[PDB]
Nucleic acid binder design. Structure first.
Ligand SMILES: Nc1ccn([C@H]2C[C@H](O)[C@@H](COP(=O)(O)NP(=O)(O)OP(=O)(O)O)O2)c(=O)n1
Ligand SMILES: [Mg+2]
Ligand SMILES: [Mg+2]
Length: 429
DNA sequence: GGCTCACACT
DNA sequence: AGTGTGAG
């Protein structure tokens, strides 16, 4: 029986990342309840990131700033840059690149989002094990590490840091240093490397982050969120049974949506651990061959999804919603906004070509019409042969112009509630 | 609520 | 090629 203990995988995720970017730039924001917002004019702006100090007051990502102020009167705000009537996330993408570049020094990474990346530490661990061969691992090498499930059995325990240490001590005391093979030893050395990586990030960028270390991406991601912020968590294969016994299905990556809901509804269960009851065939019959096999393995802590060697996004896109009364109702209006989106896209693509030695070859245009529940009413694509904003916007209109319901042709019906331009199908240059 | 991304399915 | 789900 395979135990899925073949790899050491880590997930590193920045703490309150957009807030940290603004806090680094503006020292007045440091160590205070603050949030990052976009489009200040409406209800003070929509919050997209929240500092831990602000989270203590109950401020969340969903909220309008005016509403967040009601919970947290002293809340400080930082505004996302606005360009061409649109939120521009350039500052945060550049900050992301800073972090990713540092991580790449230690190992090959998969960029999972703007503020997180998976790391395959398997090779690095082998090397490190040989280098310090026969040498026991000190607790001092793991100053911010939690061992999930520990401490166990028999006032220091009254304080969080006291508990962390006791668990770490119990873990280390148990490790067999000899035996380079031991998965637990491999995860431990993995955590040592992650400590160093996290230290390099903070020293060179000033940003703090949390991390998870386990044998696969799903567990690594789950581990990461266990002790945020500014801490890392090691989830061993052995900790899985107890961990999953009370773990809501929706917590597992990819189960947070309809699929997760269907697992709960069809099987009549609540926790990830209860999945172990069912045969692989049973799971496949309900949720399909691929999903069924994945679930059967996952509830036992086993997953084989590889850490893909990809540091750069596959697509570059910008979009804007025009909700309610703001929906675009004229041909001229639609064309003007297409131009704004195309202009920002051109800037980003030009930088991309210079920085990354690649060119996009396909242009995708997506729109939403008023009254449509679907996020995208229509998607169409055309060739992208020139990095020219006017051509791109002109081409995008050509592709969608037939969508217009109205006879006048100076007026657009139904009104458009969303425009989206995306460059794809990159090739080396 | 808003701006982005990746990927499975057909 | 075009649609839908999931996420951060
Ligand atoms: N729905 C979302 C989720 C995240 N983001 C952005 C803002 C976040 O700061 C950044 C990182 O996402 P996130 O890791 O899930 N949360 P954040 O980093 O702010 O706080 P942590 O919980 O990770 O400490 O992406 C967004 O713009 N819209
Ligand atoms: Mg984060
Ligand atoms: Mg994140």
């Amino acid at each position: 029986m395979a135990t899925g203990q073949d790899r050491v995988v880590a997930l590193v995720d920045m703490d309150c990342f957009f807030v940290q970017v603004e806090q680094r730039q503006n020292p007045h924001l440091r160590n205070k309840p603050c949030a990052v917002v976009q489009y200040k004019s409406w209800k003070g702006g929509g919050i997209i990131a929240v500092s831990y100090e602000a989270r203590a007051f109950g401020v969340t990502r969903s909220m309008w700033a005016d509403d967040a102020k009601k919970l947290c009167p002293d809340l400080l705000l930082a505004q996302v840059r606005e360009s061409r009537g649109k939120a521009n996330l350039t500052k945060y993408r550049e900050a992301s690149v800073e972090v990713m570049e540092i991580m790449s020094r230690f190992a090959v990474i998969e960029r999972a989002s703007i503020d997180e990346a998976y790391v395959d530490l398997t090779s690095a661990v082998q090397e490190r094990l040989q280098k310090l061969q026969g040498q026991p691992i000190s607790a001092d090498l793991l100053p911010s590490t939690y061992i999930e499930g520990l401490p166990q059995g028999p006032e220091e325990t009254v304080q969080k840091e006291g508990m962390r240490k006791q668990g770490l001590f119990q873990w280390l005391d148990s490790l067999q240093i000899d035996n380079l093979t031991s998965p637990d030893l491999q995860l431990t050395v993995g955590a040592v490397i992650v400590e160093e990586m996290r230290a390099a990030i903070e020293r060179e960028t000033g940003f703090q982050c949390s991390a998870g270390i386990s044998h696969n991406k799903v567990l690594a991601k789950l581990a990461c969120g266990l002790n945020k912020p500014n801490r890392q968590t090691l989830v061993s294969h052995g900790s899985v049974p107890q961990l999953f016994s009370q773990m809501p299905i929706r917590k597992i990556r990819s189960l947070g949506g309809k699929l997760g809901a269907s697992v709960i509804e069809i099987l009549g269960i609540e926790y990830m651990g209860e999945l172990t009851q069912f045969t692989e065939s049973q799971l496949q019959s309900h949720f399909g061959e691929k999903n069924g096999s994945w679930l059967y393995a996952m509830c036992r802590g086993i997953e084989h999804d590889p850490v893909k060697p990809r540091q750069l996004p596959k697509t570059i896109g910008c979009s804007k919603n025009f909700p309610g009364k703001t929906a675009l109702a004229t041909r001229e209006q639609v064309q003007w906004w297409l131009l704004q989106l195309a202009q920002e896209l051109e800037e980003r693509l030009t930088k991309d070509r210079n920085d990354n030695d690649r060119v996009a070859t396909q242009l995708v245009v997506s729109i939403r019409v008023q009254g449509d529940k679907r996020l995208s009413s229509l998607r169409r694509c055309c060739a992208l042969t020139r990095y020219d904003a006017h051509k791109m916007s002109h081409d995008a209109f050509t592709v969608i112009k037939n969508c217009n319901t109205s006879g006048i042709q100076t007026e657009w019906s139904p009104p458009l509630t969303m425009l989206f331009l995306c460059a794809t199908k990159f090739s080396a240059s």
